[PDB]
Write a protein that binds this ligand. Structure first.
Ligand SMILES: CC(=O)N[C@H]1[C@H](O[C@@H]2[C@H](O)[C@@H](O)[C@H](O[C@H]3[C@H](O)[C@@H](O)[C@H](O)O[C@@H]3CO)O[C@@H]2CO)O[C@H](CO)[C@H](O)[C@@H]1O[C@@H]1O[C@H](CO)[C@H](O)[C@H](O)[C@H]1O
Ligand SMILES: CC(=O)N[C@H]1[C@H](O[C@@H]2[C@H](O)[C@@H](O)[C@H](O[C@H]3[C@H](O)[C@@H](O)[C@H](O)O[C@@H]3CO)O[C@@H]2CO)O[C@H](CO)[C@H](O)[C@@H]1O[C@@H]1O[C@H](CO)[C@H](O)[C@H](O)[C@H]1O
Lengths: 131, 125
């Protein structure tokens, strides 16, 4: 309990397969991926968690979470907000983001963020410095 | 900021690319193909940078944005910070004082400052 994390940097989280960026808009309660204009709500806090080798992904004082059913934003840092970076051997600079609890990779379907246990081509992300 | 990078436009998320086999220079929305990885290097002229792909250098000839086989004066670009958008720069051609811009799938240049000229250059790997 009482997990903590420390912000490492601010970054965009962009998909290799469609160039789309993960975003979270608090006012619309909207979490998704968008492929056009770059907006401020596509900037995330990348955080070293208190658990070795695992990171959290934050926006608007919340944390990116996979609960076994959907990808959502959590008000509290839970074990299900821990992600590891799995380098993609064939695509230097890209990572899969693997949920610790559920061993599911961050993916997308249409405009939605999802998670998948099988490795696929739309699970490859580049997390680049926003500033 | 130096070395291999992607060069991505704020307004539409498109990335500059150059494909030697197709002789195709432009901007592209969609998948992040390897012909979108540029070499951003300090030039021989202090204060300016070259934007390199396929062993060639991005230039503006006064009419069109094209590649150059050699590092000539028209291949020199400066980074001009965008005051209102942290992390973004305009790319200003030294010889012609024209900013790198886009129109559809074309790279173009414009001496006016506009909203289509804001780029983020991020590390490729
Ligand atoms: C006004 C708005 O919601 N803009 C969002 C932006 O929305 C994009 C896109 O602009 C919009 O056209 C699209 O709408 C789709 C619609 O939802 C579907 O029902 C329909 O079938 O198809 C439409 C076209 O696809 O939704 C998109 C998002 O899915 O999304 C970006 C994402 O970065 C922003 O969230 C933007 O909102 C602005 O964000 C600002 C962030 O600094 C600020 O909070 C603005 O106030 C806010 O309007
Ligand atoms: C199939 C192809 O050439 N894909 C390119 C991609 O091309 C884009 C766009 O997808 C394509 O529809 C467009 O085609 C235009 C055509 O070139 C014109 O001659 C025609 O008159 O009008 C067409 C419609 O506009 O060209 C676009 C580029 O100008 O562009 C991307 C840029 O990153 C790639 O180059 C992609 O080809 C891929 O390149 C990879 C290497 O980077 C790899 O070799 C892939 O196998 C290859 O498919």
């Amino acid at each position: 309990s009482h997990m903590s994390s420390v912000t490492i940097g601010k970054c965009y989280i962009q998909n290799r397969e469609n160039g789309g960026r993960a975003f979270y808009n608090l006012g619309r309660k909207d979490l998704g991926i968008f492929t056009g204009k770059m907006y401020d709500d596509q900037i995330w806090s990348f955080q070293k968690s208190d658990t070795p080798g695992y990171y959290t992904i934050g926006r608007e004082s919340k944390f990116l979470q996979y609960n076994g059913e959907q990808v959502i934003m959590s008000d509290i840092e839970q074990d299900t907000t821990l992600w590891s970076l799995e380098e993609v051997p064939e695509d230097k600079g890209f990572y899969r983001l693997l949920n610790k609890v559920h061993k599911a990779y961050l993916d997308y379907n249409g405009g939605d963020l999802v998670a998948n246990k099988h490795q696929t081509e739309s699970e490859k992300w580049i997390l680049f410095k926003a500033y």
